[PDB]
A paper describes a structure:
Bloodgood and Sloboda have shown that the flagellar membrane glycoprotein 1B (FMG1B), an unusually large ≈4546 amino‐acid long molecule, constitutes a major part of the glycocalyx of C. reinhardtii, which localizes to the ciliary coat and is visible as a densely stained layer in electron microscopy sections. FMG1B is described as a mucin orthologue which lacks the major O‐glycosylation of mammalian mucins but is N‐glycosylated. The results find FMG1 to form a protective layer with adhesion‐regulative instead of adhesion‐conferring properties and an example of an undescribed class of mucins. In wild‐type cells, the ciliary membrane that surrounds the central axonemal structure is coated with a diffuse inner layer of low electron density and an outer, electron‐dense layer consisting entirely of FMG1.
Instead, we purified FMG1B from C. reinhardtii cilia by concanavalin A affinity chromatography and performed single particle cryoEM analysis. The resulting ≈3 Å structure of FMG1B revealed the molecule as a long, twisted chain of 34 individual globular subdomains of 109.6 ± 10.9 amino acids and one cysteine‐rich coiled domain. The individual subdomains fold into an Ig‐like fold with each two orthogonal beta‐sheets and one short alpha helix, which we call beta chunk repeats (BCR). We modeled the semi‐rigid structures composed of the chained BCRs to high confidence, while the flexible nature of the cysteine‐rich domain resulted in a lower local resolution density which, together with the absence of bulky, recognizable amino acids, could not be assigned confidently. The C‐terminus of FMG1B consists of an ≈100 amino‐acid long intrinsically disordered region (IDR) linker followed by a multi‐helix transmembrane domain (TMD). Due to the inherent flexibility of the linker region, no densities could be resolved for either the linker region or the TMD. Despite the high sequence variability between individual BCRs, every BCR contained a single highly conserved disulfide bridge as confirmed by MS‐assisted disulfide detection, while no disulfide bridges were detectable in the cysteine‐rich domain under our conditions. Interestingly, we observe protruding densities by cryoEM that cannot be explained by the primary peptide sequence. Strikingly, we find a near‐perfect correlation between the identified candidate sites and the unexplained electron densities. As such, we were able to directly confirm 25 glycosylation sites of FMG1B, which were mostly located to the 16 n‐terminal and the 9 c‐terminal BCRs, all of which were in proximity to each other on one side of the FMG1B molecule.
Residue numbers in the entry: 29 to 379
Amino acid sequence: GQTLSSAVLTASNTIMATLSNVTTSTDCRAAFAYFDSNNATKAASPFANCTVSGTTSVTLILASGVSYAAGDQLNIKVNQTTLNTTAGVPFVPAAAAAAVQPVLGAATLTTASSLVVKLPLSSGNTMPDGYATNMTICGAAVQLLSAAGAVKASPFSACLLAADTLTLTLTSSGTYAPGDVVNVVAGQSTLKNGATSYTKSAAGSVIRPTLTTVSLATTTTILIGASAPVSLPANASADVCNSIFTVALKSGTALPTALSACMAGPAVTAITATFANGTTYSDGLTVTIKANQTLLRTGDQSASSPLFLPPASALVIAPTVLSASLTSATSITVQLPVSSTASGTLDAAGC
């Protein structure tokens, strides 16, 4: 609390400070002042609330009407008595104000070979020209690390950036794995944040798989395709299954009970559960993981492994056909589940 540097800026309205000594402080709100590198003053009381957020960290949530700027600086204010080290020393104003610097936003693996990452700040992000085709440019922005910390040898191929969104596409050789993490490398000169740059974060972001497609496995069951190897509780109970996949009628009314049992699929990245849509049983059914899901995990059922994030919106259970049977020497008849429609001419070329 006399001279320190670091911090993690996670969103457009929240900061956190990293310090040397552990603390049990309850309040920090009125213990900081805001300037910039240009020396134009900012929020006198930048923060509305504080709580302990780590071994030594103090979270500092910005109040309304405040947005980040390059080289933002935060310094301890006068006569602050709530924040203290466990040694009994309250913070005093520092000779050099700490610099607020960013850290990447959330991440999710929408497709088995695409990684999408949001960013803490939605403007100013720029990179050296050639990032769209140079692995020396895109690949130097973020490091991909196993659970043990073994960085991967350029599993990426390209980077795509626009406003607050960023995207890194894997490769066939660089096949994805469960339980991996992504974090920035120290001093990387590629990714900027306006008139600033991005610096490695405290813990990184653990990648989570998700859902991609759904269909009818049998006449009364449904297959579910996943972007990573799946795992479910052994011989799970019906209640467990009903607490994961929220299932809604065509217009959006919920279905309290849809599944009787849930278990793995033909492949390690597939699942099969009871009931079906086929536009029977609802005529429009859709599936989606619940917001606060608990039990659908990848790699294993361990607590550390990532969860399956819910998709962007509910997936539509994709229908199939029932059977075909020869009747005459010039005709086959095919049963289709419940009514259907035709969108065009049924000429020989069309069929």
